[PDB]
Amino acid sequence: KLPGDFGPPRGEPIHAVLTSPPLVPPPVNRTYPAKVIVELEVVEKEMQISEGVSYTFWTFGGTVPGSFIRVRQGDTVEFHLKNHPSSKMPHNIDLHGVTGPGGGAASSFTAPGHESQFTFKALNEGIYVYHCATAPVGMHIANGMYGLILVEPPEGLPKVDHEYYVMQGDFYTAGKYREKGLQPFDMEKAIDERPSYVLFNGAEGALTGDKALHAKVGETVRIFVGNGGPNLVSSFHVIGAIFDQVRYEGGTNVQKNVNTTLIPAGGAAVVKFTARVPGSYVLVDHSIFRAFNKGAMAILKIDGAENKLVYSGKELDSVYLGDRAAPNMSAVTKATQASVSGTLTVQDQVQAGRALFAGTCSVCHQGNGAGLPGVFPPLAKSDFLAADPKRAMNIVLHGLNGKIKVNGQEYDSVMPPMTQLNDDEVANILTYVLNSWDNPGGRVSAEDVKKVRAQPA
Amino acid sequence: KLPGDFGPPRGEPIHAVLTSPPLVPPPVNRTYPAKVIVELEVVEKEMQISEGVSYTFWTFGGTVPGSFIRVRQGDTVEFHLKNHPSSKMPHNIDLHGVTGPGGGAASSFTAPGHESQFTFKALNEGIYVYHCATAPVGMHIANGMYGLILVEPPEGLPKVDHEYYVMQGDFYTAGKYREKGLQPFDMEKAIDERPSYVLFNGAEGALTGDKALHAKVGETVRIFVGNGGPNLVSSFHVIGAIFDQVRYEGGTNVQKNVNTTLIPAGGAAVVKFTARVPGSYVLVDHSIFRAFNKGAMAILKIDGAENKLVYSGKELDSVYLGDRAAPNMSAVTKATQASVSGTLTVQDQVQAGRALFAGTCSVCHQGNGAGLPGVFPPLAKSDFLAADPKRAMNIVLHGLNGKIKVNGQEYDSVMPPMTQLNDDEVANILTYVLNSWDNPGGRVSAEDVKKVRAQPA
Amino acid sequence: KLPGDFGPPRGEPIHAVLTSPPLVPPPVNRTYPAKVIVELEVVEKEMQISEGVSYTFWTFGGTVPGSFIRVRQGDTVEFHLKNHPSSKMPHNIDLHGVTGPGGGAASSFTAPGHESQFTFKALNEGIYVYHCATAPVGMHIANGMYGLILVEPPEGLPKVDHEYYVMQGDFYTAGKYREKGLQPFDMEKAIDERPSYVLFNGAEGALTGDKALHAKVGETVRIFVGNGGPNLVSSFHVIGAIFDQVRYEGGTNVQKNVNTTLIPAGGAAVVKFTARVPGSYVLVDHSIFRAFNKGAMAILKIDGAENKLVYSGKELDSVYLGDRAAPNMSAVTKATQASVSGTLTVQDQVQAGRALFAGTCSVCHQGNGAGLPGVFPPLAKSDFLAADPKRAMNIVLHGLNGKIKVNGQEYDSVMPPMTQLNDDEVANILTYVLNSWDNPGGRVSAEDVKKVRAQPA
Ligand code: HEC
Ligand code: HEC
Ligand code: HEC
Ligand SMILES: [Cu+2]
Ligand SMILES: [Cu+2]
Ligand SMILES: [Cu+2]
Ligand SMILES: [Cu+2]
Ligand SMILES: [Cu+2]
Ligand SMILES: [Cu+2]
Known part of the structure; x- marks a missing residue:
């Protein structure tokens, strides 16, 4: 048997509903394998990488990371990639959930204004990175072309109160960190693995202040955490808490009660958090100058009653969070x-x-x-x-x-x-x-x- | 008890048969502990690190990585290191499978034209890096002095169709990537951990094109994967597939169904792959600018019938593989x-x-x-x-x-x-x-x- | 239930006894939860980072790493941070063992000559990094502000012959490696993750020669190994041996029989070693130019009878250890x-x-x-x-x-x-x-x- 051997697709073809970060599509909530049609469009566009700093991102679905795709192990996926006419570059895709050469890359090559498609069976449950696979591969990834695909186990993931979508990347600008204007990609810094910014979800402040993730005391939170790279390995950490569980990709191993976990370039993990006391919990790359000097900080804000038996102290302020303590800049x-x-x-x-x-x-x-x-x-x-x-x-x-x-x-x-x-x-x-x-x-x-x-x- | 307590060596002394990458010696296929005599010779020689780019490698057995050594836990190993007379430097060895100071280093110091020996018991099953341990240690490792030793468990590893030997290293040339001529070692780049090349098996293209690894649809492939460093940690990944299993060194833990796995500098793993559909599968360091701009790509080419139910798409081409899609350059x-x-x-x-x-x-x-x-x-x-x-x-x-x-x-x-x-x-x-x-x-x-x-x- | 639900503190309040590296406080050896009072004082002071090279360290308790803190899961910890009057900077603390925002940071902000306090329940067993959390966070960590806190499981850790405390850090001087004088912190090297020194316990030679760790043949050794960073991930390795066990933080997973293990920036592990043959065993970062060109080497010296059946060779010398083979410099x-x-x-x-x-x-x-x-x-x-x-x-x-x-x-x-x-x-x-x-x-x-x-x- 191949894995995922749940018979031919049944029921009706499903048009996948894709979400923008930091949100996740609903659980598939299905007991049968289906044909799932996925439509993803590449857009090249200027956006703010930091306040007053523009960058030409290359995106899957208009966001960095790209749209979240959610399917069930044993599904047949008919994958359609469109390249918006405004694009200057050709693009394609490699999904780590695909069994086959290039993870889809040769069959998905798409020039500006064109569309491609290919079909694959999702044989392997897990959380997986997808990214562009167009020469020069590193330039495409560096410009933001990565996202996550979740292949659920057949019975589904256990129920939680909240699901979120966070993805780290390293970025290479000609200018220095927070130097204003439209900043070109810098190939020399990229080759040397010397990023000017290290971010969650494609911008400084994408997940801080008035953009924080939310939950309440008592609730469980699942985060699908990707590392698009291109080059860095994340010492991924939650300040002020522990992860109940960490599972990488489709791995059988699950680690419980860990605080700091290394996510490879191109890797992904599913983490679970239980909120016990209120305040701001910081997701960081604990290669500390990334988190505090390059932008690699995100917030999960927990509302609810203080528990002085557990923690007698105060909420995070600007001493630790710096200029990101505020709602925005x-x-x-x-x-x-x-x-x-x-x-x-x-x-x-x-x-x-x-x-x-x-x-x-x-x-x-x-x-x-x-x-x-x-x-x-x-x-x-x-x-x-x-x-x-x-x-x-x-x-x-x-x-x-x-x-x-x-x-x-x-x-x-x-x-x-x-x-x-x-x-x-x-x-x-x-x-x-x-x-x-x-x-x-x-x-x-x-x-x-x-x-x-x-x-x- | 010490581990490996299988009694004194029995039968006849065995002269170990060592293999050049990417091949592996046959299973030991033995139920008794033996005295195994290992003879390894250091050679310093120019070879092509890329097309038209020469480098003075320092090698164990004339190859980078060095010759593969295969023994059984509980064996007594009588290790002989020779230094070819043409060598300019002295050399020695540290095998991670050795229990004792320096992993053999003080007893194996060998000047040009000399020979040394020492004996050790292989107490610990696992895959292990060996490397030179001569001051300056980093220069010797950077010049190619590393390989693998497999210490089998007593009952042997499960049978597979193919076994291969792949080892990553970071290299430091005075010149830039693909600058032609005989390139000197560059200590300043090495100290800064800024390699000009990141390779499998000591050269660009060592495992691509007409040098690819081979297997057929349905077959199982075990790869002994080392990271000689000296400095980099590999985000080791197979494009287009998953690893059935990953086991590090002699560790008790085995991870199953993973795609991306971090191999420490000086570390080693045993990975297993099952071929399900035909085409080219790319082994990379998923710190992407290594794989696509510095040489860190190798190929496992799978022959056999397409399965359109699993993957409807085409074989890898130059869009993803670039100039390495071709048989050679x-x-x-x-x-x-x-x-x-x-x-x-x-x-x-x-x-x-x-x-x-x-x-x-x-x-x-x-x-x-x-x-x-x-x-x-x-x-x-x-x-x-x-x-x-x-x-x-x-x-x-x-x-x-x-x-x-x-x-x-x-x-x-x-x-x-x-x-x-x-x-x-x-x-x-x-x-x-x-x-x-x-x-x-x-x-x-x-x-x-x-x-x-x-x-x- | 929260974890650690062992009822309210009982017995008498315990004034914690803290140890300087490389020593560890005794096992708590207690069956009831207690109120534990911890008093830690920040001192800024010049010390030798290498022979003839001074650096202004910022310390918890006068040492790098800072004083070791040992408590029991389910304890209530009343944490007092003092800032010595001679300090020029304000300081605070984030302990990874704390459940709550900033791991203590907002409540522990302390100006020169002041004192702060906060209380927390130790809900989670494990070994954990603590560090300063004062903007700029990376500068404080880079100057030496990190240590370990052990939260024991309720029944205690298994008994061993020796417990030691080792912590890696990356350091950034204006001058080059071994350039003499008082060396300023270099922010530009720190941001680029280009350290001049990579050390165990805050100095070259802190754990070599006449400062080595000691044990005897037959004995078991537990090492609490931290990585304070700020930026590097350690390919942590024992030359000449294997780890019986490696456990990260409070993780459920325990790996056995491993040689090389990656410790994230901000991470910590408990390793166990059994001494089988005499000699010097080297703890290194196996990103080799750190260990052999930047200072990242420490020694565990094992006394006792040779076993020629296991290892026939000689003790480590200057060929491998270089100028650190000697008692001191x-x-x-x-x-x-x-x-x-x-x-x-x-x-x-x-x-x-x-x-x-x-x-x-x-x-x-x-x-x-x-x-x-x-x-x-x-x-x-x-x-x-x-x-x-x-x-x-x-x-x-x-x-x-x-x-x-x-x-x-x-x-x-x-x-x-x-x-x-x-x-x-x-x-x-x-x-x-x-x-x-x-x-x-x-x-x-x-x-x-x-x-x-x-x-x-
Ligand atoms: C897509 C990313 C490109 C790659 C890779 C290369 N070229 Fe290119 N080329 C590209 C565009 C979009 C353009 C036109 C730019 C504009 O102002 O609209 C060009 C142009 C050239 C030209 C001049 C025009 C022509 O003769 O067609 C030359 C001579 C050229 N390109 C050569 C070239 C070579 C040799 C390449 C590999 C080294 C190469 N190009 C890569 C897009 C892309
Ligand atoms: C082996 C890798 C070497 C190390 C380490 C050092 N030296 Fe050396 N030295 C070496 C060789 C092979 C040679 C001869 C080179 C040739 O053209 O054949 C030398 C030569 C010297 C000399 C001049 C000759 C002599 O007086 O013997 C001096 C003064 C010298 N070396 C000094 C020296 C010092 C002080 C070192 C540590 C800083 C050192 N050498 C290291 C090989 C090696
Ligand atoms: C603590 C680490 C500091 C931070 C962060 C900043 N400043 Fe500062 N400042 C600090 C000290 C200890 C001193 C005095 C130094 C001495 O010789 O004793 C100063 C001094 C100034 C001054 C001049 C004196 C005054 O007007 O009070 C200015 C104008 C000043 N600092 C400004 C300033 C600004 C704008 C900052 C953020 C960019 C800043 N400082 C940070 C200590 C610290
Ligand atoms: Cu693209
Ligand atoms: Cu990939
Ligand atoms: Cu050598
Ligand atoms: Cu080694
Ligand atoms: Cu401080
Ligand atoms: Cu921390």
Whole structure:
């Protein structure tokens, strides 16, 4: 016998209903094998990879990751791939759930404005990555061409309260992290496995703030977690919790009660979480500079009653989550647009800088700029800041150490350099500070910052 | 008790028969522990890491990976290491199957033209990496000094139709990927874990085309898969199939029905595959730029009857496999040699360029250069190409976008830059195109391309 | 039920006794849940990351990794974090054993000279990483802020002869590996995941030589192995042995009889080893250039009777272990200090160079400088060396090949470049050689070497 030997397809042909991340199609809830017709369309389009940063994504179904496909082991799948006429590249597909050469690739080659099809039997239960298989394969995957297909076991997966769809990827821009504008793909960084962004669901903030996943205390949550790569292996972790279960692909092994689990490039897992106490739980790649410096953080927010017997402490804030603690960073997108249009106002900068100040500066200087007398100097009503705004630009870029006097008190500490901030980020942050807390107002421009970066003090 | 406690060696001393990759010695097929004499000789020698690219490998037995060693748990192994007189370096061995300091390293230190020996009991069943353990350890491993030893369980492994031997490694050349000539080892790239090549069995194409592994529909295939490193962890994957079973080293755990499995640097696994439908199945590191831009692809070709109930589609082609779809790329080796000798002909370039055009250019321009009217412009009988061969060199290196007219039709698309191609590759590709499809002939030299690369348009 | 449902805390409140690496607190040895009070203090301080190389570590309890915490599943833990007044940064904690947002992070935020506390129930047995969770999170982790907490199962872990505590981390210095002085943290290398050092227990040599772990033939050894990252995944391996068992975090899965095991960034495992034959067993990251070029090696030294039936060979030496075969490299620290003070003597250089010569040079030239006639030239009484000390500096930095005559014999071989050695290392090595084996004496300075490095021959 082949696996999946449940006889020929029966009942009526089923047009598959595909979902956009982070949502999942309903359970198939069927006891017979079917012919399932899947229709997926490739679209190439600009979208925001971060606030004010555009990227030309190549997508299955208009999203990164691509549309979720849900079938039953033993189904016959008639797979139709369309390539939107606006596409410049040809595309195809390899689904890891397919038994046969290229996982579908040779039969699915599709030029702009064309359609292809092929048929396969889903012999193997499991969660599987699919992706584009068009030379150069890495460029297509890097541009967002990956998703998940779930092949359910015949009896279905156990019932849970919520199912979600999260997929990591590594991205390669010409520009540095959070450098604004339309950023080209960078082949040299890709070949060197040196990504500028590492994301869940194709954007910074795709699953944070007002885009978080939700559940309640007591509920069970299943997450279908993929790693599209192209290159990185995820040290996949939930901050503040444990996974009840982790199962990779269609593997027989199930691990229980684990916190950190390695998902190979091209791999996928099904994780289960039980919500025990309220708050924000962070999905990360625990290769920490990915999660905290490249975008690899997503949120599952649990509503419900505190249990002080289990955890006496407070919800996550900007100390840990940084600028992603807030509902969104829309002001950054607005100020970037206004720079482009040539209509950038002081208030546009202030609201952008407000968003960026959280975590980045507030961890030491506090959210109200007060600092901590003799330990962290104030930015609120700060004589030192007012006395020399160019020096303040140098301090953000290049750091500051040694004895200073601020508002009549001595400090003798160290502020690390923050050179990774872009010229517009420094300018907007300092403009926010100057227009808050009885400081003198005015503004700092990105051009002001560019000059200080080129000639440090 | 120690493990492996099967009493003293009995019968006659056995001179081990060692195999070159990708082949495996026969099952030991024995019910008693034996003294097994293993004789392995280190050879330092130039060989082709890619077509027209030489590298000084350091080998166990003249191959990368080194000769396969097959023994039975509870055997006494008398290990003899010889260092060929032509060697410049001393060498030794650490076998992961050895219980004792250095896995054999101090007792196996061997200068050029010398021999060493030591004895160990094989206490632990499993598949194990062996490698050189001579300071600087990473340089020796990087130059190819690794292989596998199988310590069988007492009753033997279950019978299969085929057994094969595949080992991944990361390689560090001074030159870039596919830059021709004798390439020195590059310590700086090695320390930074930035390999120029990532290979199965010591060369690009070692297991592709006319060097593929073979089996038939219905047959079972066991592959002993090693990762010699030195530095990379493999996201080891079979395109178009699943592994029936994966077992690491001598581990008790066996995973079944998995597609993607992480093999640590220095690790090894036994995988099993059942062939269900015909075609080419690709073993890759699914850190995708390794498999598709650095050489990390191998083929298992399955012969037999199509099963349209399982897979309705076509065999792998150059869209996915690129220039490795073909039986070999011997023409590239020939043209490189002819450049060195100073006898490079137009036809030498044409045949090299023919090989390199597959996938690289044909994915968009087609294998016959026809393109797709109004979508991908033709290279066949192309007025645009003929009008300006220097512009064509600039297009390959630096890309092309915007409105053009080719053979009377408008195109308004994007051809990405292909800067990673070497000067000789661009020159040979364009020479092929110029001497095909009623184009004007002539040639492009690598020196022509070098000048365009230095001064883009 | 929640897990850990063993009723309210009983008996007396327990003040936890925390241990410094590589030691572990005693088993809890208790049948009832307790309130456990944990007091941990953050200290920022300079310490030696390698001989003569200082780094400002940020520590939990004054060590890297931080103090080990041992509790029982179902305990109520009242966690107190203090920040020493000498600190310049604020700090907090995320323990992977905590159920709740941030693993404790928001409730543990602590400015210099302050204290925080929070309470949590230990619901989940297992070994878990804890680390600082203060923006920028990666900088805090990179500076050493991580450790382990063991939550025992209710019945305790099985008894063993020895328990040890080892934790890997990746470190990012401005300077290159073994470049002397106080080295700043390097954010750019951290973001790129390009560490200068990869260590066990916060320093080169922390667990080698006269700092090795110990046990005897026949004994069982449990090691709690953490990977603090921030970024790297360890291909964790014991040279010369196998792990009886490996269990990750609180996972249900236990793997037996494995040699190489991948520990995620932020992950932890419990490994068990049975000592069968005497000698030095090396714990490494088998991403080999980490273990042999960046510091990622630790030793478990087993005392007891040889068993020639199992292993006929010799203890580890400098061929494999390099300069870490020796009890320590204190002379390097002394000579560095003397350079700083301006009191560097010839004998200070000689003793430093003696330490550095082991492995690095002795693998080919022997520990007595004799070489191997016609294969490796002598450094002992070497006419060639004496004739031109500047040439000798060029040879170490830039290599040597081709025919030479040394002490009346021809050599026609290759000495690779050793450019990664720092100016002081080359100077001290050559000073050692010049003042040994009837060579002419005198000295080479680091300034002499700096000039040759800038103008190769
Ligand atoms: C803690 C790690 C810090 C973060 C994050 C930021 N700053 Fe800071 N800042 C810090 C210290 C300890 C000091 C004093 C250093 C010394 O020599 O003692 C400073 C100083 C400033 C100043 C000048 C003094 C004042 O006006 O209060 C400015 C203008 C300043 N810092 C701004 C600033 C901004 C805008 C930040 C986010 C980009 C930021 N700091 C982060 C400590 C820390
Ligand atoms: C699809 C991704 C492409 C690959 C791979 C290659 N080329 Fe291409 N090419 C492509 C397009 C869409 C265009 C037109 C761009 C525009 O502005 O509309 C081109 C154009 C050329 C041309 C000039 C026009 C012509 O003569 O047809 C040349 C000479 C050309 N391409 C050559 C070429 C070669 C040799 C390739 C492999 C190295 C190659 N192209 C790849 C799309 C694609
Ligand atoms: C084997 C891999 C080597 C290591 C490690 C080192 N050296 Fe070496 N050395 C080696 C060879 C094969 C040769 C001769 C090369 C040739 O052209 O045939 C050398 C030569 C030297 C010399 C000059 C000759 C002599 O005086 O014997 C010097 C001074 C020398 N080597 C020094 C040296 C030092 C100090 C090393 C550690 C830093 C070192 N060598 C390593 C082979 C090897
Ligand atoms: Cu595509
Ligand atoms: Cu794939
Ligand atoms: Cu060797
Ligand atoms: Cu090894
Ligand atoms: Cu901290
Ligand atoms: Cu963590």
